[model samples]
Target chain A: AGITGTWYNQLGSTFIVTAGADGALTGTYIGARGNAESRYVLTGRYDSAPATDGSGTALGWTVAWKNNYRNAHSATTWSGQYVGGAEARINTQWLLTSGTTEANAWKSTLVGHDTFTKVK
Target chain B: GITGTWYNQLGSTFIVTAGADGALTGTYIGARGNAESRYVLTGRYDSAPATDGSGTALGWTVAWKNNYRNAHSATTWSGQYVGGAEARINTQWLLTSGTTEANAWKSTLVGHDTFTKVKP
Candidate 1:
């Protein structure tokens, strides 16, 4: 319910989500790359569903970018809450995985913030 | 035809089979709180798609629908169907499946979404 929808962030990408049985969410990561819209993979979770007697829910999602040279080896995960009621939005903190090697470990976990609103 | 799999921003997926005469049938698969559930939906499609925001609308409802908490109430969604190679729908929804008006009114549980055609 309050967590399933099309959401766009101010930082980098626009994502869409679908709820599967048991709070599992699936969707697409539509990013601007190669000079146009490109499809990326997305998976997420919401912990407030059927709990409709609730105001908000815990939200977490991961985007796997099918990057070329420009976006290669990059993935991001957002952890937050699906805020309900009057001004509904998903607010979260994002941690991006930049590299996999020990030398690049310092840049591996980049922390940030994102607030997603309904797409009109 | 508006019959196809559709996804929206709220993290939900809908599979609908629309008819030439406007009969509509679909299923809702998405988050309700922290639980994922499925429900059979019934409604109707109407009018032709228009650009100036005239015509192209539809409505549906799930009565006595229970939320994650198993509360009995009714929910209705009214929207518009536009024509295109990849069609889309603009919708306004109200979920009255709460124990009281205050619980459901926390932000209008009223939401607006543009549903995009995912597959035929």
Candidate 2:
């Protein structure tokens, strides 16, 4: 039971995460690449960096929270931060707070830098 | 049914919100801005007295969030106060709780000035 790699944001382009506590990687992100489908809810955290350009001093940190995004328009709320380098990396941010405005009134920003390379 | 404009980022720029249709405007945003980009928050509130000469209450309170230019990464929050003229019109704040890190993490703040737009 060892699979830890997270990074999300698929509407503004940036995705790569690993979580399956019954799909605990959860969801939220509507019309990501300008498709204009807005519905958000999120939360997150994960920090582990001691090297690899981010520079030493931090090899542990993980956090998460979400109210909706793929849960179907509950008014977006997300929180995520993961810092673990040399293979384990992550970065994300959210808060569209609420939905229902003609495709959720369009909003997005996602990134999974280093692209979660570990095809397990 | 003619009320719009909902801006966020309690840790930084912009805020003049009005929504209460049983709260049809939900939540989600660990941090946001980027992709089809739309977050150029700058709050001087209003300027129409002598700003070209600086007099409409002095014409410069200033506000900026996440430092625009599309944005990437997140951290930091803000606060201001002045009251009834000469700047700092109206601002209430909050943006902190769980899953930390963003300008040293733990954020909470919201903003709007000009006596919250004529006290509603």
Candidate 3:
């Protein structure tokens, strides 16, 4: 199967990815209610870039999403490499920004060193 | 001289240069604890009117990229030259993420900094 499927993390976050033939990817994330209680709509692109370490062809992907249940927005970009043709290991970083403009409150956090595995 | 190296109490380093036409170019290197990786910066300074309606002065706008994470971030320094050897910069940082033109989001990374010229 391709990258078009449902993926779940240990935190119970669900990702539904739909990949196009032209390398366009659209997805949705349903996070665990205990974590954020939010639903995110995601969009990104897939690049067929060569891996730096001669592993194989790397998948360059960038996804940006918005929260539906909370006052926050985020974007995650990653490069994934397939392990067994059905599983992928992704090196990911997330940029999160929260708060409102009216109240004069806003903050951003850049969190990285996160790894995600694709479920077969 | 207006062009040289600079340092802050936070251990951030900057190398700056002033052009013949009064244009400014520079680089900044710093890290925000362990939450964000070490960032390598490149930016330019431009002349603009002060927010308090003072007069035309030099301000800075810099673009930064992480050394470990592959992402684009930027910062703007809004301040005046204190003397021939120093500047007080009010820094505003930004981190943005979006998958497509329709669902993009931007957030401000909050902080401020001051730059003093390094004289040898």
Candidate 4:
């Protein structure tokens, strides 16, 4: 699909996803959520499964945040989907699992939603 | 009542009205329909959590009235109503069509929709 590119959200955080013409994907995430100067490794895979809206392919990516302050290292996994098609927007849903590794960590499981656009 | 009218990312729409009890009634109109048509929908509201996650669970069924297509379909949607003042719902739908020995597998479709309730 038309997924491999430099993508940025409204918050100015940008990430790069490069697909190897198959299902594997890897990129670099540059944002304030982690070290502002370092590029965090982005890992994910393109699922042949249909989109949430049952359109294009679906994807999931994860970033293990570098604990620049707290010794407790945390990670966030995001569900990526393009509703409608390539002409539509990339809807990203993320859950930040931190603080506790137990079930239903409601406080630590921060939820985030965003629409990303490709960089020209 | 669930809501008045709701929409999805697929650009499709449905109009639903909830009764004082658990009775739910609705109509579905797909964007792909060139000819104006309204599918009949009847369902019930569940106060418990939804199949996929948390919310005010509810479900509905649609009987498609055909005009051009040779065979019609019956679709059932299982959903959860998580929105109170927030106004959001989630659903997983399955469409089954035709008759007889069930030879065609592609004739069936499984899809999901995140419906955002529209309110004044």
Of the candidates shown, which would achieve the greatest DockQ relative to the real structure? 3
lDDT of each: 0.54, 0.25, 0.41, 0.54
lDDT of 1 at B104: 27
Tell me the DockQ of each model, to 2 decimals: 0.02, 0.02, 0.03, 0.02
Q: What shift in Å separates residue B69 of candidate 4 from its native position after superposition?
A: 6.4
Over the true interface, candidate 3 deviates by an RMSD, in Å, of 13.4
Superior candidate under TM-score, 1 versus 3: 1
Per-residue lDDT tens digits for candidate 3, residues B74-101, read: 3433323333224433233333321222
lDDT for A109 (candidate 2): 14
DockQ of 3: 0.03
lDDT of 3 by residue, A1-120 (tens): 146777666656777777666434566666676355566555444432222432322232333343434422223433233222445544333333221222322233343434455662
Q: What local lDDT does model 4 show for residue A68?
A: 40
Model 1 misplaced stretches (Cα beyond 4 Å): A32-37, A48-55, A67-71, B1-120
Chain B TM-score in each of the candidates: 0.69, 0.22, 0.57, 0.77
* Fnat scores for every prediction: 0.00, 0.00, 0.00, 0.00
- Per-residue CA lDDT of candidate 4, range A50-86, in tens? 3242443445555555424322234455554443455
Q: Model 1 over residues A1-120: C-alpha lDDT tens digits?
A: 666678887756677788655555667777644243376556544443334545445445555343232333444555555666777777655555432333444344455667888863
